[PDB]
């Protein structure tokens, strides 16, 4: 968010409108890895073995 | 699309149709077809080279009649050698001659030689005979 | 060629390496459909010149 | 002054190529037939 | 020995058939019939495999 | 304006007259009319040329004659022969146009292979040119 | 090839200089500068577009006087 | 006087003015040549900024 | 990289030193998050051993 | 960050490229020391488990 804010304060205004699709999809992709993803050493169970 | 959009026209005044290879020059708000690069430079005043532009873009700008000097040179690349060398040559058939101009350093290999010392040659012109030696006739 | 294959295939032996190869042909055929259909619909050219 | 164009080259003969192509077409069809029928 | 010897006349006869100067088109069917003759003789004779 | 209109294969063209406050071109396109040089001071040549939507480049006229019109407003004659056609392209069938209009555009030399095969050291200079104003 | 495009001589008879745009046409083993595309097509007999060639390559082949129809 | 010699063999004159020299890209020092040798090449039209600012409908062929 | 490049083509050139620190630090985070999911254990049944 | 910012306000602007590599690499070392500080694990007591 800081990168986008820095660019907006700088005045490029490149991310306005449809250009925003790059930050938006990245922010969503990061969200998937941190909350879901896969279990650790104490979570050996998974769909392929169950 | 963001790294190179369609609206970035007018980068230079000498443009060439990327497909047809045709050459155009911009004056005011119109595009005029030019006969050659030499006359395109002189009209514009810049020592530039043609910039290739997509043919779909040049069709959206108003035309004009042909401009320039017909038959002028089409390419420039100035060169400066260490020394300047010229030869004028005559070669006789066996009742007939041809004249050649050479620009650059000659090739003196083989039986070719400088006419130094007592060497000489004799030729005809206007009925008179002339002896060539010491670099004079 | 279809009748020829239909008559000979049921009474011959094929090694695992070849049976595994014919399976992958289906997937290799499925993958290019979407990348090609959008090309035929001119979408990539339409977007690049917006 | 008029430009001096070179004389165009003659097209290669198609007859040797067609019989040569006919040779492989014929030989492979002939050889394949005796191999296939013998399986019966 | 007799069978093996018969292949050469048949081979050059096919190679020489095309008209005009000798070159590329003669080699195409010349080596072609030589290939089929040996392959054909091998299966039905079952000998001299090398 | 006099107007001539025709559809391919119809037995006759339609001739009409139009009038109004301005030439029949949209105000958005008004700025791209071409202004000719007009070296012929007689009343036999036009002052301006405009190419609207769906115009025609390769044209035939009423034994028939073939002509090619450039975007600069000049017209060039094309030989009827297979050589000239096959060499330039122009294999498609030309559109029809009336001689009373087509003759108003300035004419260049015909595109015949028999005369393109020439060499030169220098070309002749053009008399009576016009000023290019910046 | 994408970073710094160039070209090379091939069978095609209509060529143009990669950096200067000049038009040349081949006749035998010699290159003639042509006044325009129309006469270049008409002299060679092939309906085609010019092939861009590296300027250091064009300089090696022999030349001839200008050819074609002026103003076409 | 200053001249330009083309690869095709013709020679063209250059008007010795700051604007012509800079427009063509000839702000450089020229090499010497003798008139006996140079006079033998065919001469084309003169290169100058005024000579090029002209429009033509179509070119003639004498 | 696309998000970064798109800003340079607009000419804002806000990156370098102070600016570049954001994408530089942000880049390490992605590698750590995907590495953490794969680093769940270590045991082998590889072809060379089978 | 305060130490770095104070130098820019003075105008020496020695950072960027050659200079920035010191604070960039130095910044990693601090995080690496706190990581060793949170060392150990596998205790797995938590309010949701109790």
Interface of H with B in 9-28 (CB under 8 A): 12, 19-20, 22-26, 28
What E26-33 contacts at long range (C-beta under 8 Å, 24+ apart), as own/partner pairs, is: E26/D20, E28/D20, E28/D21, E28/D23, E28/D24, E29/D19, E29/D20, E29/D23, E29/D24, E29/D27, E32/D23, E32/D24, E32/D27, E32/D28, E33/D23, E33/D27
The secondary structure of residue F107, as a DSSP letter, is: B
Mutate: best of I13, I18, I31, partner J, most J CBs <10 A:
I18
Give dist(CA F118, CA F113) in Å, integer.
10
> For residues F32 and B62, is the Cβ–Cβ distance under 8 A?
yes
Interface of G with B in 39-58 (CB under 8 A): 49-50
Terminal-residue alpha carbon distance, chain A: 39
Give dist(CA G29, CA G63) in Å, integer.
9
Tell me whether residues G64 and H8 touch, CB distance under 8 A.
Answer: yes
Q: How near does any CA of chain H get to the CA of G59, in Å?
A: 9
Mutate: best of B34, B65, B75, B78, partner G, most G CBs <10 A:
B75
Strand order of the β-sheet with B66-67 is: B66-67, H54-56, F130-131
Q: What is the 3-class SS of E8-44, one letter each residue?
A: HHHHHHHHHCCCCCCCHHHHHHHHHHHHHHHHHHHHH
Interface of D with F in 1-40 (CB under 8 A): 1-3, 5
Go through chain I and tell me how many residues it has: 50
Helix (H, G, I), strand (E, B) or coil at B65: coil
Chain A neighbours (≥3 Cβ pairs under 8 A) are I
Interface of G with D in 25-54 (CB under 8 A): 27-28, 43
Give dist(CA H41, CA H38) in Å, integer.
6
- Reported in sequence order, the residue ranges of chain H that DSSP labels E, i.e. its strands, are 3-5, 11-13, 54-56
The answer for residues whose C-beta is within 8 angstroms of residue I6's C-beta and 6 or more apart is A14, A19, A22, B2, B3
Helix (H, G, I), strand (E, B) or coil at F30: helix
Task: Name the β-bridge partners of G14.
Answer: G25
Distance of CA A33 to the CA centre of its chain: 8
Give dist(CA B40, CA B12) in Å, integer.
12
Closest partner residue to H37 (CB to CB) among B43, B72, B88 is B88
Asked how this structure was determined, the answer is cryo-EM
Q: What share of chain G is helix, strand, coil (3-state, %, to 5)?
A: 15, 30, 55
Burial group, residue H11, by CB count within 10 angstroms (0-12, 13-18, 19+): middle
* Per-position DSSP letters for J1-50, written without gaps between them: -HHHHHHHHTT----STTTTHHHHHHHHHHHHHHHHHT--------TTT-
> For residues F111 and F78, is the Cβ–Cβ distance under 8 A?
yes
The helix or strand, by DSSP H or E, that contains position A29, with its residue range, turns out to be helix A21-35
Give dist(CA J32, CA J26) in Å, integer.
10
Kindly list the distances between the CA atom of residue E14 and the CA atoms of B9, E9, E35, in Å, as whole numbers in the listed order: 67, 9, 12
Q: What share of chain I is helix, strand, coil (3-state, %, to 5)?
A: 50, 0, 50
Give dist(CA B50, CA B41) in Å, integer.
10
Give dist(CA B122, CA B133) in Å, integer.
9
Q: How near does any CA of chain C get to the CA of B9, in Å?
A: 14
> For residues E26 and E15, is the Cβ–Cβ distance under 8 A?
yes
Tell me whether residues D27 and E36 touch, CB distance under 8 A.
Answer: yes
- Reported in sequence order, the residue ranges of F6-129 that DSSP labels E, i.e. its strands, are 14-17, 34-35, 48-49, 58-61, 65-69, 75-78, 95-96, 119-120
**Residue D16 touches partner E, C-beta closer than 8 Å:** yes
Strands F95-96 and F58-61: parallel
Mutate: best of H14, H29, H52, partner B, most B CBs <10 A:
H52
**Residue G69 touches partner H, C-beta closer than 8 Å:** yes
Tell me whether residues B19 and G71 touch, CB distance under 8 A.
Answer: no
Strands F130-131 and B86-92: unpaired
Terminal-residue alpha carbon distance, chain H: 30
Helices and strands per DSSP (H, E), number in chain A? 2, 0
Give dist(CA A4, CA A18) in Å, integer.
14
Within 8 A of H42 by CB-CB distance, chain F residues are 121-122
User: Does chain D touch chain B (at least 3 C-beta pairs within 8 Å)?
Assistant: no
Give dist(CA E12, CA E5) in Å, integer.
12
Closest by CA position to F102, among listed F64, F61, F134: F61
Strands F14-17 and G51-53: unpaired
Q: How near does any CA of chain D get to the CA of E21, in Å?
A: 10
* Other residues' Cβ atoms within 10 Å of the Cβ of residue G67: 21
> For residues B123 and B132, is the Cβ–Cβ distance under 8 A?
yes
Helix (H, G, I), strand (E, B) or coil at B132: strand
* Other residues' Cβ atoms within 10 Å of the Cβ of residue B39: 26
Within 8 A of G66 by CB-CB distance, chain F residues are 119-121, 123
Helix (H, G, I), strand (E, B) or coil at H43: strand
Q: How many CB pairs under 8 A join D and E?
A: 47
Closest by CA position to F114, among listed D6, G40, D2: D2
Longest CA–CA separation in chain B, Å: 82
Three-point CA angle D30, D36, D40, nearest 5°? 135
Closest by CA position to H12, among listed F118, B85, B102, H26: H26
Tell me whether residues E19 and D16 touch, CB distance under 8 A.
Answer: yes
Rounded CA Rg of chain J: 19
Resolution in A: 3.8
Residue in chain B lying closest to C47 (CA)? B1
Mutate: best of D12, D16, D18, D26, partner E, most E CBs <10 A:
D16
Rounded CA Rg of chain E: 13
* Per-position DSSP letters for B90-130, written without gaps between them: EEE----EEEEEEES-----TT-----TT--EEEEETTEEE
> For residues F132 and B27, is the Cβ–Cβ distance under 8 A?
yes
Give dist(CA D23, CA F131) in Å, integer.
72
Give dist(CA H46, CA H50) in Å, integer.
10
Helices and strands per DSSP (H, E), number in chain F? 3, 10
Longest CA–CA separation in chain A, Å: 53
Q: How near does any CA of chain F get to the CA of H52, in Å?
A: 9
> For residues B136 and B123, is the Cβ–Cβ distance under 8 A?
no
The secondary structure of residue H14, as a DSSP letter, is: B
Closest partner residue to B66 (CB to CB) among H12, H36, H56 is H56
Give the helix ranges, DSSP H, for chain F: 82-88, 99-102, 113-116
* Per-position DSSP letters for G12-39, written without gaps between them: -SEEEETTT--EEEEETTEEEEBS-HHH
């Amino acid at each position: 968010g800081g990168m986008v804010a820095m660019v907006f304060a700088s005045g490029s205004h490149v991310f306005g409108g449809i250009g925003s699709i790059f930050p938006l999809f990245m922010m969503v992709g990061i969200m998937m890895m941190m909350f879901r993803g896969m279990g650790g050493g104490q979570q050996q169970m998974s769909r392929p073995k169950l | 699309s963001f790294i190179s959009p369609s609206g970035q026209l007018n980068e230079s005044p000498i443009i060439a149709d990327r497909d047809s290879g045709a050459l155009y020059v911009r004056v005011g708000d119109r595009l005029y077809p030019a006969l050659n690069l030499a006359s395109a430079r002189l009209i514009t005043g810049r020592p530039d080279n043609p910039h290739l532009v997509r043919s779909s873009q040049i069709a959206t700008m108003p035309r004009g009649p042909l401009v320039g000097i017909p038959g002028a040179p089409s390419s420039f690349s100035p060169k400066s050698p260490p020394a300047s060398s010229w030869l004028v040559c005559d070669t006789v058939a066996t009742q007939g001659v041809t004249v050649t101009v050479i620009d650059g350093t000659p090739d003196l290999t083989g039986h070719r030689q400088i006419l130094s010392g007592s060497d000489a040659v004799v030729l005809r012109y206007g009925g008179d005979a002339w002896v060539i030696r010491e670099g004079r006739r | 060629a279809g009748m020829a294959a239909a008559a000979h295939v049921p009474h011959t032996i094929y090694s695992p390496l070849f049976r595994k190869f014919v399976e992958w042909i289906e997937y290799l055929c499925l993958m290019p459909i979407f990348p090609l259909a959008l090309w035929l619909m001119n979408v990539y050219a339409a977007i690049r010149y917006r | 002054a008029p430009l001096v164009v070179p004389q165009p080259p003659a097209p290669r003969d198609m007859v040797p190529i067609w019989v040569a192509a006919g040779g492989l077409a014929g030989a492979l069809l002939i050889g394949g037939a005796v191999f296939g029928t013998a399986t019966l | 020995i007799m069978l093996m010897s018969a292949i050469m006349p048949v081979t050059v006869a096919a190679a020489a058939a095309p008209p005009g100067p000798v070159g590329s088109p003669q080699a195409v069917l010349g080596f072609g019939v030589l290939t089929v003759a040996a392959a054909l003789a091998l299966r039905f004779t079952g000998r001299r495999l090398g | 304006c006099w107007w001539w209109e025709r559809t391919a294969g119809e037995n006759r063209a339609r001739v009409r007259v139009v009038s109004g406050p301005t030439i029949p071109v949209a105000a958005t396109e008004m700025n791209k009319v071409v202004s000719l040089v007009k070296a012929d001071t007689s009343g036999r040549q036009a002052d301006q040329v405009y190419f609207g939507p769906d115009h025609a480049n390769f044209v035939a006229v009423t034994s028939e004659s073939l002509w090619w019109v450039t975007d600069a407003g000049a017209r060039f004659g094309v030989e009827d022969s297979k050589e000239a056609r096959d060499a330039l392209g122009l294999t498609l069938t030309p559109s029809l146009a009336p001689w009373v209009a087509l003759r108003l555009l300035p004419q260049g030399p015909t595109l015949s292979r028999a005369d393109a095969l020439v060499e030169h050291d220098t070309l002749p200079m053009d008399m009576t040119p016009a000023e290019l104003v910046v």
